């Protein structure tokens, strides 16, 4: 793979039928969540992450803009995912801080379900990285 930058999409379990502010945004912005995502253990290999250079903390926050844009009470989980030809590498190291080496990586299709401030995103982002197949 190459470590690269691409246009992501969002997915949620939002209800089409109802008025809670960003249920309303998500129904017009995101797709439904697949109840069984893929999680593939990296055998053996290690890669270098950098929460500070992650252009998922660059597209997130632009969707948070359009969220409030039309917004004006409970948040639900939103997932961020990659298109064909790309995939998300996830760091499973427990004393990982955000940067440097990470021996236990795995690949995921979408991120975890995120409660909704760049720093609040990075509080959960840290372990995610995009590469191109």
């Amino acid at each position, epitope marked *: 793979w190459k470590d690269a930058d691409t*246009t*992501l*999409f*969002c*997915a949620s379990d939002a209800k*089409a*039928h109802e008025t809670e502010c960003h249920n309303v945004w998500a*129904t*017009h*912005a*995101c*797709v*439904p969540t*697949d109840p069984n995502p893929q999680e593939i253990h990296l055998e053996n290999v290690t890669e270098n992450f950098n929460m500070w250079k992650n252009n998922m903390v660059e*597209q997130m926050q*632009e*969707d948070v803009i*359009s969220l409030w*844009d039309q917004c004006l009470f409970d948040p639900i989980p939103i997932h961020y*995912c990659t*298109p*064909a030809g790309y995939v998300i590498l996830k760091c499973n190291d427990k004393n990982f801080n955000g940067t440097g080496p990470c021996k236990n990586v795995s690949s995921v299709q979408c991120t975890h379900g995120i409660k909704p401030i760049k720093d609040n995103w990075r509080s959960e982002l840290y372990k995610y990285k995009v590469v191109q197949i």
Partner: antibody
Amino acid sequence: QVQLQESGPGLVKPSQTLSLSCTVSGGSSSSGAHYWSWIRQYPGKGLEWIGYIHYSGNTYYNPSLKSRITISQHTSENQFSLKLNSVTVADTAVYYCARGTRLRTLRNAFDIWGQGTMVTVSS
Amino acid sequence: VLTQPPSASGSPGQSVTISCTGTSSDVGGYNYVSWYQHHPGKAPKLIISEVNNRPSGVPDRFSGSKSGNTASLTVSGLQAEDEAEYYCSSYTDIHNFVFGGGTKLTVLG
């Protein structure tokens, strides 16, 4: 690379039931988080959204089609289809299949289209 | 359900603008206006998405906008290859879409 090929009848009798098939070829079908849509153009007129179905199996038809309509998928052979019922001469149009995206910067637009196939209703 | 003018013309080099009038629940209720270029007997090309966003491989000179309920597409610096028919669509309500009648952009020869 991902193109959309629509197959189907040219002619159908009134009151019958058109059904068209669109074959993806690049390219995902099931694989992606897109929407797989049917759009017809009345030559001139003229353009109208029929409905689409999502990789998850979620259908979304146009409200103005009072149950005259179902859409479905073959995750297998990377193709999908519309079945329009009780057709009258009104339903005579070119039918395009298209891929709807919910990627950011392309939200609720139709990035990939099919070249179109002409369908004529007549007794 | 959206409203465009039938024709729109300009000579080579000039700049041309195309209206697309909706309602407060169509355009002006959502920033999901799209524009499609349709050459005859060929598959329509998407050229503007989310109001004013050029996809990859779509030239610098096409541009979108909306004022209130009237979206608008501009083509700066005409060339022969721009002569075609242009439609606009907008998202509307829980999963629904509307289009315009289409506008014939004639590059005057």
